[PDB]
Design a protein around this ligand. Structure first.
Ligand SMILES: CCCCCCCCO[C@@H]1O[C@H](CO)[C@@H](O)[C@H](O)[C@H]1O
Ligand SMILES: CCCCCCCCO[C@@H]1O[C@H](CO)[C@@H](O)[C@H](O)[C@H]1O
Ligand SMILES: CCCCCCCCO[C@@H]1O[C@H](CO)[C@@H](O)[C@H](O)[C@H]1O
Ligand SMILES: CCCCCCCCO[C@@H]1O[C@H](CO)[C@@H](O)[C@H](O)[C@H]1O
Ligand SMILES: CCCCCCCCO[C@@H]1O[C@H](CO)[C@@H](O)[C@H](O)[C@H]1O
Length: 672
């Protein structure tokens, strides 16, 4: 029921309160997710301070933090990596399966081997913890024929309550503001928690998710006319044909073993085998519009006659396999007459991604005037799919970190992760070894206020070679941070103020000279990359016993080596707040809502006719909720999203993608 979650293992791999973490940490609680109906990982991230989204199409969105892209999401500290163009729906993961989401902003190289200096996102699974049959079931009806049904049930399976089990299952069907769009999803997670004898705990489970989308969009609506004037469409407008579909199926097995070897020492072994399979047939439009006739003009027609295509069709299928295990120990040691905490462990991960494609380009004659276009396009007589990609990544790490007690109110965190990383591709192989250091310092001024200072890093390997022919050294994302954290009411209310600087280094830059003794391979030089700098402030917790409020604000600057704004489509200033208020005179009633505000964003498009700049001015989005506790078991929740019905663009960096219009939702819940 509390917005503030007391402790976390996030950032350092050591169990502590947020105050003791010398990094910017945000934790999204179960209650916040229930109040605002954050049902997907994507919805959690877009309502999280310092995280922004870019929606390429109806089901594909990418998430950014501090000017950089998040390239992996994790489940119980196990990460799964992805490429921008191969979106396996990881942000569509159903939240009903997870207790909470831990967000760490900056360089998270101690938690994971590779990545960008953006953010680590960790989804924590629901566990069977009650010693009594407990659960809840719910039915939700909303706008665009949405129906959502969820059951969460748990119980011990033995008289002593040593063996316990929890099952979460659900189904959702809905349409959209988009013409012909339909999504159907099934989700299910099962877990068995058994306390083996004394000092041993074992967890084992299975996760299944399936999302089938009909008429999903690919790309956006033509933003530009040949004369430079911009275009506007009804938010219901879709380029998705009736034969278009995207279907994905997720199957995972996972086990966690915890052993208490001695007083103050515990060993943990987390393992997972994950698989996702997808099949899709879709069509996209990517062109300018000739205002007089409505005819489309290709953005690459300058290259010649075979390059004037205005869209495409594609039949894409594939499979991702993840076999990963994390083994670590945490305990105490005494040096210089004082107790200090020590964490050490290892990681192994094997990730394979195999894709099949069949595709064709679309020319202006094939589609006709865009003014009469509504997905009414003939399906391609698909040729046989061919192996488009087959990649295997082996990531192996050894990591150690100690929290040193310099004095009672002063702690120094010193860590390092060494990583052996390898990729095997159809065209090449690359192996890289890197040591990522962690240095932090936390000073407790008094019982409620603390200051911190930290140096954190992460590395990103790159498929670029120098004049010698050797692969270029990986990109390092270095985060320098100073801040102030407060804790009140035994961590029930917390505040954080962070000032950061990110230096992305060893970024490949073309020399404009080919590699001697190669077939035109371009030679690259390692140079300083993106520099990002900003401030974050968040207040999270209970103001009073019946008033829970989360309030955040950020402002940052991100620029490349040249000095140009990196991703100008993402807001530099944002304010995200959400609140819950239970009436002291009527405690059966809880009211609330929230406001997400962002400043102006833009994107320049260099075309043949000149430079066209996309604009999206300042806007807020308002959500409201109310919950009435009818009986000790039954409650009714009503939610309104985008109350002022703001028309806004979620894809300023490309073709027009509209954001969610005003939507309503009624939910009945039976708890016990
Ligand atoms: C959609 C789910 C509706 C659940 C309605 C549950 C009604 C519970 O009903 C109770 O169940 C108990 C045993 O479980 C019995 O011991 C009680 O006598 C009975 O009143
Ligand atoms: C052992 C602990 C060492 C921690 C080193 C952290 C140094 C902080 O680094 C500083 O952070 C500022 C951002 O607030 C930047 O403006 C400064 O340029 C940067 O030097
Ligand atoms: C007590 C203050 C300690 C450092 C926190 C303030 C850091 C704010 O950031 C500062 O912004 C300035 C320009 O606005 C730059 O000149 C500084 O390099 C940069 O550190
Ligand atoms: C001392 C505690 C912080 C004081 C309030 C925050 C003011 C931070 O100052 C801001 O920091 C940014 C990041 O370095 C700079 O880019 C901005 O120019 C500067 O205004
Ligand atoms: C798939 C739908 C599952 C419905 C499960 C209903 C479980 C009811 O469970 C019962 O609920 C009663 C209160 O309603 C309590 O008296 C009992 O503790 C509990 O056993």
């Amino acid at each position: 029921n509390d917005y503030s979650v007391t402790s976390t293992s996030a950032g350092t791999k050591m169990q502590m309160t947020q105050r003791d973490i010398p990094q910017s940490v945000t934790i999204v609680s179960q209650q916040r997710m229930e109040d605002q109906q954050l049902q997907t990982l994507g919805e959690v991230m877009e309502n999280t301070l310092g995280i922004s989204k870019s929606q390429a199409d109806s089901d594909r969105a990418l998430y950014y933090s501090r000017g950089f892209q998040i390239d992996n999401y994790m489940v119980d500290g196990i990460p799964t990596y992805f490429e921008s163009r191969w979106n396996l729906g990881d942000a569509l993961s159903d939240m009903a399966l997870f207790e909470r989401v831990e967000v760490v902003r900056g360089a998270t190289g101690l938690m994971t081997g590779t990545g960008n200096p953006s953010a680590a996102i960790n989804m924590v699974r629901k566990h069977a913890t009650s010693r009594e049959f407990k659960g809840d079931v719910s039915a939700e009806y909303g706008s665009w024929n949405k129906e959502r049904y969820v059951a969460d049930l748990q119980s011990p399976l033995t008289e002593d309550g040593k063996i316990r089990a929890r099952i979460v299952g659900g189904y959702q069907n809905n349409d959209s503001w988009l013409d012909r769009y339909n999504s159907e999803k099934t989700f299910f997670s099962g877990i068995v928690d058994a306390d083996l004898g004394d000092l041993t705990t074992l967890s084992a489970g299975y996760e299944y998710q399936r999302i089938d989308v009909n008429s999903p969009t690919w790309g956006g609506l033509p933003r530009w006319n040949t004369d430079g004037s911009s275009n506007s469409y009804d938010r219901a407008r879709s380029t998705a044909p009736d034969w278009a579909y995207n279907d994905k199926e997720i199957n995972k097995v996972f086990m966690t073993l915890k052993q208490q070897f001695a007083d103050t020492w515990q060993a943990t072994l987390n393992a997972t085998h994950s698989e996702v399979e997808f099949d899709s047939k879709m069509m996209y439009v990517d062109a300018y519009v000739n205002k007089a006739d409505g005819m489309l003009v290709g953005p690459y027609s300058n290259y010649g006659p075979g390059f004037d295509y205005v869209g495409g069709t594609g039949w894409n299928s594939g499979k991702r396999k993840v076999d990963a295990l994390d083994l670590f120990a945490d305990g105490s040691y005494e040096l210089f007459g004082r107790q200090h905490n020590l964490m050490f462990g290892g990681s192994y991960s094997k990730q394979n991604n195999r894709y099949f494609s069949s595709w064709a380009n679309i020319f202006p004659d094939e589609i006709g005037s865009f003014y009469n276009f509504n997905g009414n396009f003939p399906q391609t007589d698909w040729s046989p799919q061919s192996l488009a990609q087959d990649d295997t990544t082996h990531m192996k790490s050894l990591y150690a970190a100690t929290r040193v007690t310099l004095a009672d109110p002063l702690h120094l965190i010193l860590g390092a992760r060494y990583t052996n990383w390898r990729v095997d591709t159809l065209t090449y192989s690359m192996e890289k070894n890197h040591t990522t250091p962690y240095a932090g310092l936390v000073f407790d001024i008094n019982d409620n206020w603390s200051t911190y200072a930290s140096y954190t890093s992460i590395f990103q390997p790159q498929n670029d070679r120098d004049s010698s022919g050797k692969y270029l050294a990986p990109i390092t994302g270095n985060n320098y941070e100073l801040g102030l954290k407060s804790d009140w009411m035994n961590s029930r209310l917390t505040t954080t103020l962070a000032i950061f600087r990110i230096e992305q280094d060893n970024v490949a830059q073309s020399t404009g000279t080919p590699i001697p003794g190669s077939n035109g391979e371009t030679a690259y030089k390692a140079v300083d990359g993106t520099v990002s700098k900003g401030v974050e402030f968040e207040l999270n917790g209970a103001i009073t016993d019946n008033w829970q409020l989360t309030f955040g604000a950020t402002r940052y600057i991100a620029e490349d080596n040249e000095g140009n704004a990196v991703n100008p489509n993402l807001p530099r200033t944002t304010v995200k707040m959400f609140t819950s208020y239970r009436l002291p005179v009527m405690p059966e009633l809880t009211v609330g809502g929230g406001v997400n505000w962002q400043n102006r964003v833009y994107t320049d498009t260099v075309t043949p006719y000149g430079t066209f700049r996309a604009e999206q001015g300042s806007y807020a989005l308002v959500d409201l909720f109310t919950r009435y506790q009818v009986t000790k078991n039954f409650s009714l929740q009503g939610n309104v999203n985008n109350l002022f019905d703001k028309t806004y663009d979620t894809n300023v960096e490309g073709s027009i993608v509209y954001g969610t219009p005003r939507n309503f939702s009624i939910t009945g819940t039976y708890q016990f």
